[PDB]
Amino acid sequence: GTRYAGKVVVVTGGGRGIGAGIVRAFVNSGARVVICDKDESGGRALEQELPGAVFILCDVTQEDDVKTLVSETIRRFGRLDCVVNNAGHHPPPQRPEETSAQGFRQLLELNLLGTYTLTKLALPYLRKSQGNVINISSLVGAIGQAQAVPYVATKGAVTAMTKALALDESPYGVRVNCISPGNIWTPLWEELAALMPDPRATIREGMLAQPLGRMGQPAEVGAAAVFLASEANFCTGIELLVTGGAELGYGCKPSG
Amino acid sequence: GTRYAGKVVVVTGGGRGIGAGIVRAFVNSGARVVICDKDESGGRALEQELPGAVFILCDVTQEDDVKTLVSETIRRFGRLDCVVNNAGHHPPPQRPEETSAQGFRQLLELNLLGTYTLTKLALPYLRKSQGNVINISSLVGAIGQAQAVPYVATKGAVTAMTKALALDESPYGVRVNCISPGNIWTPLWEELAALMPDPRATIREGMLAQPLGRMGQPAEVGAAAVFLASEANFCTGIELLVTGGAELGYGCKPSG
Amino acid sequence: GTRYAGKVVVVTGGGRGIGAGIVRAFVNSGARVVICDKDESGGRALEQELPGAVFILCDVTQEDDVKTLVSETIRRFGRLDCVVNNAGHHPPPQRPEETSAQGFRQLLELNLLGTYTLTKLALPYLRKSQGNVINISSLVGAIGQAQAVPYVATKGAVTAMTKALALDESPYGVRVNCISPGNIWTPLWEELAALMPDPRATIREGMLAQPLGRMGQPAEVGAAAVFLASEANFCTGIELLVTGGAELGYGCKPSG
Amino acid sequence: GTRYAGKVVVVTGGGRGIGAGIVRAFVNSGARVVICDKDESGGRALEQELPGAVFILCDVTQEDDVKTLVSETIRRFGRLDCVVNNAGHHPPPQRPEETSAQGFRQLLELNLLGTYTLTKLALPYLRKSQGNVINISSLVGAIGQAQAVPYVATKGAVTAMTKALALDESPYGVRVNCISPGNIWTPLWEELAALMPDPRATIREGMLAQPLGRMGQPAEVGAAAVFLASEANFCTGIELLVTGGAELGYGCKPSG
Numbered sequence A, B, C, D: 001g002t003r004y005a006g007k008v009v010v011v012t013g014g015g016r017g018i019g020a021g022i023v024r025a026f027v028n029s030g031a032r033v034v035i036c037d038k039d040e041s042g043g044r045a046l047e048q049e050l051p052g053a054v055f056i057l058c059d060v061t062q063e064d065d066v067k068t069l070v071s072e073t074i075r076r077f078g079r080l081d082c083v084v085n086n087a088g089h090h091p092p093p094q095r096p097e098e099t100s101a102q103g104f105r106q107l108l109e110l111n112l113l114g115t116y117t118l119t120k121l122a123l124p125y126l127r128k129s130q131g132n133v134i135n136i137s138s139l140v141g142a143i144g145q146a147q148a149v150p151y152v153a154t155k156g157a158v159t160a161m162t163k164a165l166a167l168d169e170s171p172y173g174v175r176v177n178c179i180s181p182g183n184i185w186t187p188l189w190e191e192l193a194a195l196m197p198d199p200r201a202t203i204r205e206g207m208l209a210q211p212l213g214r215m216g217q218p219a220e221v222g223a224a225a226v227f228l229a230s231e232a233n234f235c236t237g238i239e240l241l242v243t244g245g246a247e248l249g250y251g252c253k254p255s256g
């Protein structure tokens, strides 16, 4: 591919799921990709699979891991053009009274501060390349979700942070955007469904939450990411919905 | 009541449903209310019922009716403080290929231009009173609805128009806001449900579209309207959602 | 290009400005493009310029023009995959009291019903191709604009209509999305600025309304359109903002 | 007043600014109000001033303070109907590279987790009263702000959390809403302006960010809060904008 040839991209949580779909999309567009992940299994195999992708073990909640991620990226490839903050986690459904402040803080540490930390360490290099930041948020940050108060809050923060940072970095020509996926079929979706009383039914309800009648694919998030990086030069601070239309119209969720 | 004492309010489509609930709320707040409606039956009885409400027959799609509505309001009460553009219609569910351009134009004539015309004729008097405009839009203008392309489009236009007019009239201290109700139990809802194969089931689905598990009441829209008129002095161009939370979260509406 | 090879695209108002930028983007992606415009000058030259683009004279407010546009497209190219409803107009700045209902109706005829009519005539063919609709709306439909009540209202309607139609056509795999550009430097922008007391200053204010410090280009809208057509297969009913961040943060627009 | 007579309201950060305006509004509506604040000076004087208001020293970042706030409220007044999470802080303008993860965590501790903690401890009592939660967020959570990445992120989280909790508590008839104020003239605004090179100019720019040409007042936020508590019985999960129209239209913030 030539759409993003000669560019260098870091993707966190790139070892599986949406992150791996994003990794593949950027490789297909001609970019060199650093795969960052806290687990080795998926990311290491993906490095072997994809010419132009390399794997760096890095836990985004550990600032020294992230500092080394950036320095190794520059040392090995000489520039940095795009950072995709995809690493994140959705806890199992929890009622509000079943949540804790410390569990909330830990989820904020991954979903929000890890995104914050990599972005901050990368920005000096992005400014030199007039690169861009892509945060992976969630539709539920905008519309809410049941039994997920901490998760929804972290994603509301990421989407808002994307806009604030877009304002700050616009004078330097660094664009900052986010993608808000809806139901994307990933290993995380599969794992969460398996915890449920009826996994197959939970999966069917998840497919039917979209007017398109299916869940999305990691490759479709990946294509949205490559668009924001390579072709959306007048887009900054936007929230790109990749949701199959889940937010549209009425659904199941006289005046007394 | 004293919240809006000494003020004069015009409510279109005030003879039944949401409009009548709005009429009652303003009367309860101490205002004098002109009830405008194209049908006499509901509005005339409401005038007899409510001290401080009077009924003026007026079809908002007829500019001469609307001109007389405003002039009679000033002649009889000496001022005009608030205009509530509530008159509107929801056609029966229609597939896109079952719609027509001329049916679309007629619906725009009622839901949009009738609101436009009364607002324009009222604004010279609202400027003198530092009054305000309240348009009744719909949640489906913001999130869409199935089998209602013309209706949804008219309400998208009303909500947008509310913001444009708010900008234009802010130098004169005239506020312009809208209410976007979701499912409100009114004679219109009842009539539309009766057209359906299973009316009782359509009504149950309508109640369940809200997390609160019920439809809203005209009185609840009325309270929102009295708030915008009497107490929201720093609110202009807002869309006040009165929807029971229908827009929140996933509902019924693997990656292949 | 190969991103949209073998596909057939109709672009209305394709003779200049954003429409011509969209035409060029689809030609660059390998598509055959029918340029529709009410004026011959730009579109005819563009047909001569671009192999794979042809010009069909068509006023989208004339249903017989639009019927012939679709039938000629099928007759000459054998399929139809994407319709881009770009034709539209922004009147000069007008205060609300300077507007008329009939001027409002005429603007609705172009900006809204022309989009409605082509979409309706095209949908049987889009369903056969699992094609898609792209409406060009405006950021001011979502946030309002001063001295543009009719224009803002037409664009609020287009954005809302996009969501309603997305719901209706999702069972058939036809996606329906819109692009909301902000300030894009086009012949229309230039013409409107020339009417102003100080054109150069109006143009400078227009550049500064964006955090990126410039207006957008038609080519950038074109790239967004090609993305929605060719790569956003899980996107339907979305509003893709192409605005340079104009909607972000505070600007120029103690408590007494 | 009688609008909220016999009800018991807790307002955090109630000692000055928006919180004190909210306290006064609920007292004026007939409610008994517990003023919570980490500083004694404002809240203690307000207790002496207002019959029906009492002051409880409580730092919302200290879970034992908050536990005692709730238990003392029940012990002294026998019920709890409304919690207004107003306590929060806006740091001085900081460039992204001038922020720290630990400063971010501390701001999240106040603006987000303090709101989370009081809400969680209050909900068993709100469920018994079918009471409601009102979170004070900010417009900049939705539209972003320059030099305020941590602040904007905390408010994006609060707004999103409001919707998630609304979903969770709707089965119990507990409504959860938020107010997003724009520029409100408070001691915090005054203090931040005084740090600036030109305070008077910063204040003038702040007034002009609104189409209404002024900042808002705490009393106007207070009226919005009393509406959500006492009269918005079909509103849950909404974001009530109290911004003077700052989010509307273009402002200061050719295609190259």
Ligand SMILES: NC(=O)c1ccc[n+]([C@@H]2O[C@H](COP(=O)([O-])OP(=O)(O)OC[C@H]3O[C@@H](n4cnc5c(N)ncnc54)[C@H](O)[C@@H]3O)[C@@H](O)[C@H]2O)c1
Binding pocket: A012, A013, A014, A015, A016, A017, A018, A019, A036, A037, A038, A039, A042, A058, A059, A060, A061, A086, A087, A088, A089, A090, A110, A114, A136, A137, A138, A139, A180, A181, A182, A183, A184, A185, A186, A187, A188, A189
């Ligand atoms: N799957 C969906 O439906 C969905 C929807 C909306 C948003 N999202 C978001 O998309 C992102 C990816 O989700 P997914 O479904 O692909 O998840 P996933 O669990 O399948 O994969 C996430 C990857 O990130 C890695 N990761 C987790 N914590 C990490 C850390 N501390 N440091 C580095 N890597 C770490 C994991 O090891 C894994 O490889 C998340 O931010 C999630 O919130 C997912």
Ligand SMILES: NC(=O)c1ccc[n+]([C@@H]2O[C@H](COP(=O)([O-])OP(=O)(O)OC[C@H]3O[C@@H](n4cnc5c(N)ncnc54)[C@H](O)[C@@H]3O)[C@@H](O)[C@H]2O)c1
Binding pocket: B012, B013, B014, B015, B016, B017, B018, B019, B036, B037, B038, B039, B042, B058, B059, B060, B061, B086, B087, B088, B089, B090, B110, B114, B136, B137, B138, B139, B180, B181, B182, B183, B184, B185, B186, B187, B188, B189
């Ligand atoms: N009912 C809902 O669930 C719902 C939801 C969202 C928005 N709305 C909007 O609320 C408004 C009122 O709806 P409703 O359900 O109360 O409807 P309704 O049919 O019960 O009452 C509407 C009233 O307006 C009058 N009216 C209609 N056309 C008129 C005209 N040309 N001139 C003057 N009066 C006219 C009718 O005679 C009637 O009295 C409409 O704008 C509607 O789109 C309704």
Ligand SMILES: NC(=O)c1ccc[n+]([C@@H]2O[C@H](COP(=O)([O-])OP(=O)(O)OC[C@H]3O[C@@H](n4cnc5c(N)ncnc54)[C@H](O)[C@@H]3O)[C@@H](O)[C@H]2O)c1
Binding pocket: C012, C013, C014, C015, C016, C017, C018, C019, C036, C037, C038, C039, C042, C058, C059, C060, C061, C086, C087, C088, C089, C090, C110, C114, C136, C137, C138, C139, C180, C181, C182, C183, C184, C185, C186, C187, C188, C189
């Ligand atoms: N320029 C901007 O800043 C801007 C911003 C947001 C949205 N938009 C929208 O983008 C679209 C294009 O705007 P532009 O600035 O390129 O305008 P433009 O005036 O430069 O070009 C519009 C083209 O459409 C054609 N057209 C007009 N009426 C037509 C009709 N009845 N039938 C067929 N063709 C017709 C014109 O002849 C012209 O070739 C419009 O819908 C406009 O509202 C523009």
Ligand SMILES: NC(=O)c1ccc[n+]([C@@H]2O[C@H](COP(=O)([O-])OP(=O)(O)OC[C@H]3O[C@@H](n4cnc5c(N)ncnc54)[C@H](O)[C@@H]3O)[C@@H](O)[C@H]2O)c1
Binding pocket: D012, D013, D014, D015, D016, D017, D018, D019, D036, D037, D038, D039, D042, D058, D059, D060, D061, D086, D087, D088, D089, D090, D110, D114, D136, D137, D138, D139, D180, D181, D182, D183, D184, D185, D186, D187, D188, D189
């Ligand atoms: N002023 C504005 O323009 C503005 C705009 C939007 C949102 N807001 C929000 O409104 C709220 C109030 O802002 P304000 O301008 O009135 O601020 P303020 O500084 O004038 O008053 C805030 C009050 O909260 C108290 N407080 C702070 N930390 C506390 C803690 N840990 N525990 C208990 N009380 C604590 C302070 O002592 C003070 O009395 C905040 O959440 C703020 O983010 C303000």
Ligand SMILES: Cc1cc(-c2cccc(C(=O)c3ccc(F)c(O)c3)n2)ccc1O
Binding pocket: A090, A092, A093, A137, A138, A139, A140, A145, A146, A147, A148, A181, A182, A183, A184, A188, A189, A192, A193
């Ligand atoms: C019944 C319920 C289900 C989930 C759930 C189940 C599987 C996967 C996910 C998930 O990872 C997800 C799904 C949609 C999103 F927009 C998103 O950001 C993440 N969630 C969560 C909460 C629930 O109350």
Ligand SMILES: Cc1cc(-c2cccc(C(=O)c3ccc(F)c(O)c3)n2)ccc1O
Binding pocket: B090, B092, B093, B137, B138, B139, B140, B145, B146, B147, B148, B181, B182, B183, B184, B188, B189, B192, B193
């Ligand atoms: C199955 C279906 C139902 C309706 C329907 C049925 C009864 C009443 C209404 C209605 O008057 C309404 C309902 C909600 C709104 F936000 C609104 O502005 C109006 N609508 C419409 C379309 C449908 O595809």
Ligand SMILES: Cc1cc(-c2cccc(C(=O)c3ccc(F)c(O)c3)n2)ccc1O
Binding pocket: C090, C092, C093, C137, C138, C139, C140, C145, C146, C147, C148, C181, C182, C183, C184, C188, C189, C192, C193
């Ligand atoms: C001072 C003022 C200016 C304009 C104006 C001037 C030049 C071009 C345009 C325009 O065509 C446009 C600009 C932005 C949009 F989002 C859009 O859909 C169209 N508008 C309009 C109104 C005004 O009160």
Ligand SMILES: Cc1cc(-c2cccc(C(=O)c3ccc(F)c(O)c3)n2)ccc1O
Binding pocket: D090, D092, D093, D137, D138, D139, D140, D145, D146, D147, D148, D181, D182, D183, D184, D188, D189, D192, D193
């Ligand atoms: C030049 C600049 C100014 C501020 C600033 C100055 C005074 C007060 C505030 C404030 O407390 C505030 C203002 C608006 C809000 F919507 C809000 O939630 C809080 N802010 C902040 C950042 C800046 O880059």
Ligand code: NA
Binding pocket: A046, A047, A048, A049, A050, A051, A052, A053, A054
């Ligand atoms: Na490799």
Ligand code: NA
Binding pocket: B046, B047, B048, B049, B050, B051, B052, B053, B054
């Ligand atoms: Na009477």
Ligand code: NA
Binding pocket: C046, C047, C048, C049, C050, C051, C052, C053, C054
């Ligand atoms: Na050609």
Ligand code: NA
Binding pocket: D046, D047, D048, D049, D050, D051, D052, D053, D054
């Ligand atoms: Na007292």
